[model samples]
Target chain A: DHIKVIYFNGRGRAESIRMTLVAAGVNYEDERISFQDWPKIKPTIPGGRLPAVKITDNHGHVKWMVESLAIARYMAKKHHMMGGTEEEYYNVEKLIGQAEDLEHEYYKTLMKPEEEKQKIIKEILNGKVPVLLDIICESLKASTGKLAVGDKVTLADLVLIAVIDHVTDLDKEFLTGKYPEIHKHRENLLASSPRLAKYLSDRA
Target chain B: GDHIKVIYFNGRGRAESIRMTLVAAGVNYEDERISFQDWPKIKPTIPGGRLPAVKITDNHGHVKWMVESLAIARYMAKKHHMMGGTEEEYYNVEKLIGQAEDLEHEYYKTLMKPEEEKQKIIKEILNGKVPVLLDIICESLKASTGKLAVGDKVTLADLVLIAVIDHVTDLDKEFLTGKYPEIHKHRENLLASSPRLAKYLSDRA
Candidate 1:
């Protein structure tokens, strides 16, 4: 009825898939592969990447959806979370773009030497992270409702969770309610959504 | 007419894809090119801290600013009938976009390193990365869209790839267009697809 996801033990890009799967009320058998087993089995895989999925039908026909955002949006579309119209979808995309911008700003410093990385990391911690949070909070404030784009919870809200999760992994105390609007948004989702609560609990 | 204001430097770096998208969509926008000297001061003014931000005014007159080139490209893809007919086809387009991005990121990273560092990185890229990635794209084209990319329609996937193909050819003549006959023909078709685009590249040549 659902699908099987092939990803690493850790959630690099696959975290968004996990977020969308829970929000969309979709079932997925998470096949987490350890790094030790990757090299031998990698060449056999189709795309040479993690975060691939195989969706099975009632007739047992299978198809693979690769790429994390692609899979996330595909799941959202299938489950009616992708927004009502094209313009509404574009609005959701604005927030999604902001989310990845912050993630990549953090990533842009990864390949540098230690001292060089330290300088940029500070910029990320101070400049990029806070500004990203500012933008997300401002957009979140634009909605008086609990969700991001519209009346109901859309993929933007779920997508933001994956963004916050990335920053949280980078700094454990990072999401410590520093930005009150974001903290409130996070709390609202957890407080109301049984699926998200259940998913977090299951992982814990 | 809806208003779209694009802010970027005069250069055709990351902003070219956005420009190409607007052209493909046949929408008009304010392409504001700021000097490099003003970027440090201007950086803080924009969200997510980058140029090439699009300020869109929808028909509803609601204004919003969207950043990230790929996100902007994907947004245009949806608006402009480029997402393909099915969910699976959209996924195929995403893979193409991601692949081009990975290659471009590696290429740009080389530009920032020291002399020998750039040499070393370029050597690694040319030797190890390019061949496998080129093989994948060629294999991808065989699946769909003999003319454009991804199932007979031209998406930002093609626009972005064409931009990089130009970049490659600019670096070493006969390197890019000479690689794959299919992609070579793909570029020629894209060049002729739009009259404005034809002049845009013709000016450089």
Candidate 2:
């Protein structure tokens, strides 16, 4: 079976799955839909959602899975990047949940009034995002291989990078010299896995 | 033997489903309910500073802790073989859970609004979006051969579906059973099958 990562033409959510699969050397298609086409296409998609993944079997049967984190988890499981143990697997799951919460809070605030939006976004980038980084840093510090959970790149690492990169984009100084551990972890991961680095460089 | 412990506030706001999953799985777990007054003092001890965290201890006395309610429920559901029967089935279950989560977020948001604004939002939710959400769930269950949400046996999908319906029922009890018979009956059959879960539901409130 092969999978296709589907999302809008942006790095909002689906980028993590694309990066994960590429980092794992798993072959898949990245399908991006423009905002112009989303309205016509949205009605037909599962949960009327983007960031869904399409899986096609050898027999030509297909299924579309929704939820960005769930899709990334399924892809990680297929490539054995979930983790090596039961504890590690749930740890990875925990981090993914936290990352989603952080992202959700940010997106929810984006719809706020303009004056309030800047204030709330600033509070989140400084307040919640740093707490999350500190939490991730604790795990990365203890990690022997400097990955999120285990020795190899798991879904946790991909999600952490995705969220950190996003928050960093919003406030450039939020991450620089802020959380040294996450900074070092992201650097080490890109250095070790050139595929992920290449994907980041080439994508929008 | 392994042991499980659930930590949360005194109420069943978010941790109810996690507790329900354990009871359905017939697993005995320690339910640590903390008072709101003590939450701040306790929050710093947790890694992510989230409530409804779970601590698991294996037979070998190895202990592990993780926060996030849905993740904890999904982990225990998978451990108890309630996630799904197959790999693809698991994805379907997760998708259903995701749909339910969207409903839950809106419901919770409505609940937290001021009484005047809350009524307006609740009306909009019940009259506008709730039916569409319920129908999507009912359609999924209709595609299944059994009363369960995904596969033959119970999955995380069923638990989440029931939990969200219960939350929405806070606004109108009739809407759940009257408009969404498929979902209403699914809840009935599940509670009937699991006496422990039924008892917890009856007694938790």
Candidate 3:
């Protein structure tokens, strides 16, 4: 009964885990700390980072698992959200890596100065984003089902959905009318899962 | 009954950790080092147009190709039981790998920049980020069996850490020994305990 996800109030990195947990039907506390209190509590956190999952067992043993992707994968694996087969699992992992690259570009572009933000954004959207999207779409197109891995909603779907949502917000015009495979995959995934659909609507 | 081939450039850019994990697994695989001159012609045949792809032929004569160095390492390590013995250990190993890749990503970018900008980012890495990340790693190491990163045995956590230590130490020789004594001892003990890996590294040297 002692599971808590501690992060900033906003769903920058923690949202994926939240979505994954909801998809898994796992319930836990969503502990959101403000920026003012973060500096005070930063030293206490492992890896000195937010998005840490605090888990407690029956024996009252406390453990904090940091790293957003790690936590997301852990919950997904625990709930059988990883995939069906060994090959499917690693394919999911590969797609997770690709999604992370897209997320990296999003953050890197934001870190630039105001004057260079648009220029960097344009380059990323033109340069690597399309390649990453193409790679992701290849998996979706080749999959046996509508999802990335197989006929189920795996962690790959959750991570990719969250990442694409982020990028879609970053520049909607760029994503428009492109990668019909990902768009269809996203639509099929959200339509199939009511928990996911409701969470998307609640958050959106 | 199975054949494994690791294709990469001669130097240890992305394939070193993969090679180290294979050595740790005691698997005798063919190390097919490609020349840069042949890369442009060869890149098209690769799945993602990336080097360090692993081509595997299982005992049943099934051939499969896998890209991404981390994925290759994980697949090998899992097959060999270096991933971890338990569920928590498995994710812990994964966490350390993500952390190591986080640092290596910056390391790669730092080397790619021009001289002045490279020095600026390199300083930030060595002076600022490495210590914080190393401190976290040391904390985890200290909490473990005191020999490995996850459990009682050597996992990818140990191999990945030593690989990263090699990179940071290349920039500053005393990088770990000066402050992170636990990490230093961890590196030393990892190499000392891993004969095949140590031999492979020494042979390359």
**Best model per TM-score:** 3
Q: All predictions: root-mean-square deviation over Cα?
A: 3.6, 2.8, 2.2
Q: What order do candidates take by lDDT, descending?
A: 3, 2, 1
Ranking by DockQ: 3, 2, 1
**Per-residue lDDT of candidate 3, residues A1-204 (tens digit):** 588999984658888789889988888888898878988899888778888989999899998889887788778888888776777777787778778878888776665687798888888888788888887787678777878878788888888988897777668876689899899988888887789999889977
Q: Evaluate fnat for each of the predicted models and list the values in order.
A: 0.48, 0.46, 0.37
TM-scores of the models, in the order given = 0.84, 0.88, 0.93
Residue-wise C-alpha lDDT for candidate 2, range A1-204, written one tens digit per residue = 888878884768787778778988988887888878999988878777678888899998988777776677777887888878766777777777777776766675554688987888877876777776676677677665767776688888888888876776667787766778888878877887888988888874
Task: Grade the docking of candidate 1.
Answer: acceptable
- State the number of backbone clashes in model 3: 0
- Which segments of model 2 are wrong by more than 4 Å? A56-60, A111-116, A142-144, B1-3, B56-64, B111-114, B127-129
List A-chain TM-scores for all predictions.
Answer: 0.86, 0.88, 0.92
- Please write out the lDDT profile of model 3 over residues B1-205, one tens digit for every residue: 8899999984767788788888998989898888878999989887777778888889998988887777677767777888778778878888887777776776776765688997788788887777777787777778775477777677988888878877777666776666877787787778777888878878988
Per-residue error (Å), model 1, residue A58: 4.7
Candidate 2 per-residue C-alpha lDDT over B33-127 given as tens digits, one digit per residue, 9 for 90 to 100: 88878998998877667788887789999987867788788778878998777777776787688778878877877865689999988888888
lDDT of each: 0.74, 0.78, 0.80
Judged by DockQ relative to the true structure, which candidate is superior, 2 or 3?
3
Q: What's the C-alpha lDDT at position A117 in model 3?
A: 84
